[PDB]
A paper describes a structure:
In the classical nuclear import pathway, importin alpha recognizes cargo exhibiting a nuclear localization signal, and this complex is transported through the nuclear pore complex by importin beta. IMPα proteins consist of three functional domains, an N-terminal IMPβ-binding ([name]) domain that mediates interaction with IMPβ, ten ARM domains that recognize and interact with cargo, and a C-terminal CAS domain (involving ARM 10) that mediates nuclear export and recycling. The Trp and Asn are absent in ARM repeats 5 and 6, resulting in the segregation of IMPα binding regions into major (ARM 2–4) and minor (ARM 6–8) sites. There are seven isoforms of human IMPα, grouped into three subfamilies that exhibit specificity for specific nuclear cargo.
Here, we present the first crystal structure of human importin alpha 7 lacking the [name] domain solved at 2.5 Å resolution. Here, we describe the first structure of IMPα7 NLS binding domain (ARMS 1–10) in the cargo-free state. The cargo binding domain (ARMS 1–10) of IMPα7Δ[name] was successfully cloned and expressed, and crystals diffracting at Australia National Synchrotron MX2 beamline to 2.5 Å were indexed in the space group P21 21 21 with unit cell parameters of a = 64.85, b = 75.84, c = 88.97. The structure was solved using molecular replacement in Phaser23 using chain A of PDB model 4UAD19. The final model of IMPα7Δ[name] consists of 424 residues (80–503) and 34 waters, with 79 helix-helix intramolecular interactions (analyzed in PDBSum). The structure is comprised of ten ARM domains, each consisting of three α-helices H1, H2 and H3 in a triangular arrangement, and overall forming a concave assembly. Structural alignment using Superpose in CCP4 revealed highly similar structures, with an r.m.s.d of 0.66 Å for IMPα7 mainchain residues of 80–503 (424 residues). Very little difference in structure was observed between the cargo-bound and free states, implying that importin alpha 7 does not undergo conformational change when binding cargo. We found that IMPα7 was most structurally similar to IMPα5, ranging in r.m.s.d values of 1.3–1.5 Å, whilst IMPα1 structures ranged from r.m.s.d values of 1.4–2.2 Å, and IMPα3 structures ranged from r.m.s.d values of 1.5–2.5 Å. We also found that comparing the unbound structure of IMPα1 with α7 revealed structural differences in the positioning at the major site (ARM 4) and ARMS 1, 9–10, whilst comparisons between unbound IMPα3 and α7 revealed structural differences at both the major and minor sites as well as ARM extremities.
Residue numbers in the entry: 80 to 503
């Protein structure tokens, strides 16, 4: 507990007792798992007193201890970080980034990171205090690995968030620094940078173009094969987000030789990586016919069909999305190739699952295949849809019929349309 002597000494006038009491507060606040944050911040003027000590540029130890206590306070709930923010500490921490004491600089970086990572509200508060430029200047002139780690972590926190997202113009001046950071060897640095890039690349294609222009694609594709999962996972997220852009932006990643790496990742021992790789490939196959041809020539679709009929439902949903996108924008010959691999049966087997989204994707895929079957039957003049009999051999016709009683309107309206147009 905080003693009445502690409070009296914190507000004393002798720097010695001030430092001793601030150190006592910091040590109590650094206690886990239940720090006494509420008791401290509920003591009136104590947080204000720490923020006042932050301005004691003559005492390096008092500055450092007060900054550390405020960091511990900011490591709690949002309402406990609000007290640090409302005391006016963010502008002081951003000016302490240029302190002559390296300890104070690192502690201020850690505090601003904690504050920025509490919520999107605190993130935008810190950004609107003009932190990016001082932070980027400190990150380029750092002589401590731990300080660079903390600074990159705080930068990532400044870039994270989608509800709401940060104003891109306030976080995009950092994309040059992250591109250079991707060339380091520290796994923590690479991981935080990849997370920042994954969030900066999640959005409209203009943000993706900004990320591409920084020249990060080759390095991210290389990091896809990183041994440390904490680095490969965010890198795969970033690549998958990038391949959601137009066909040129996706072609950049494809030219970074990403399809072979994605193929290897499809055989990962972790279902999360397999799901994310399937999702990336589905974004790719949603592109033009050249990128679908690239996925074909990469020998990826056989593995996707295996996944479609053996993996977990979360991964099979993405594999089905990949196959269906391929059938949607592919040529008759490419879809003939997909059918020759035996995709109709694993797609029909998914019409009986509880996830209505998987059912809808499978239905759309079968619909595309049947549409091209009808077109080819027209060209032949025989009226023979060659792929109708294949859906019959899969015992999928009665599955489509059963889907007319589904609760989802999209599914049961799509099930009636198929039976009416193709199965007459």
């Amino acid at each position: 507990v905080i003693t009445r002597e502690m409070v009296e000494m914190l507000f004393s006038d002798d720097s010695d007792l001030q430092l001793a009491t601030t150190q006592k507060f910091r040590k109590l606040l650094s206690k886990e798992p239940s720090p006494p944050i509420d008791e401290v911040i509920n003591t009136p003027r104590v947080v204000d007193r720490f923020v006042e000590f932050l301005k004691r540029n003559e005492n390096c130890t008092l500055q450092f201890e007060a900054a550390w206590a405020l960091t511990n306070i900011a490591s709690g709930t949002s309402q406990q970080t609000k007290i640090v923010i409302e005391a006016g500490a963010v502008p002081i921490f951003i000016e302490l980034l240029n302190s002559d004491f390296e300890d104070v600089q690192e502690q201020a970086v850690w505090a601003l990171g904690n504050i920025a990572g509490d919520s999107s509200v605190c993130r935008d508060y810190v950004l609107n205090c003009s932190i990016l430029n001082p932070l980027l200047t400190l990150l380029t002139k750092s002589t401590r690995l731990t300080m660079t780690r903390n600074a990159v972590w705080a930068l990532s926190n400044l870039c994270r968030g989608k509800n709401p997202p940060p104003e891109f113009a306030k976080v995009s001046p950092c994309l040059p620094v992250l591109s250079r950071l991707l060339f380091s060897s520290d796994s923590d640095l690479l991981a935080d940078a990849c997370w920042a890039l994954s969030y900066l690349s999640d959005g409209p294609n203009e943000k993706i173009q900004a990320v591409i222009d920084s020249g990060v694609c080759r390095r991210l594709v290389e990091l896809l094969m990183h041994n440390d999962y904490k680095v490969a996972s965010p890198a795969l997220r970033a690549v998958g987000n990038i391949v959601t852009g137009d066909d040129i932006q996706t072609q950049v990643i494809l030219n970074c030789s990403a399809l072979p790496c994605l193929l290897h990742l499809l055989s990962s021992p972790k279902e999360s990586i397999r799901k994310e790789a399937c999702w990336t490939i589905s974004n790719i196959t949603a592109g033009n016919r050249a990128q679908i041809q690239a996925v074909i020539d990469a020998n990826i679709f056989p593995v996707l069909i295996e996944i479609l009929q053996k993996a977990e439902f979360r991964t099979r949903k993405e594999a089905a999305w990949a196959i269906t996108n391929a059938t949607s924008g592919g040529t008759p010959e490419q879809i003939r190739y997909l059918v020759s691999l035996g995709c109709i049966k694993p797609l029909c087997d998914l019409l009986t699952v509880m996830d209505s989204k998987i059912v809808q994707v499978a239905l759309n895929g079968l619909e595309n295949i049947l549409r091209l079957g009808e077109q080819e039957g027209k060209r032949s003049g025989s009226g023979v849809n060659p792929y109708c009999g294949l859906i019959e051999e899969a015992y999928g016709l009665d599955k489509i019929e059963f889907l007319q009683s589904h609760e989802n309107q999209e599914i049961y309206q799509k099930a009636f349309d198929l039976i009416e147009h193709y199965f007459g």
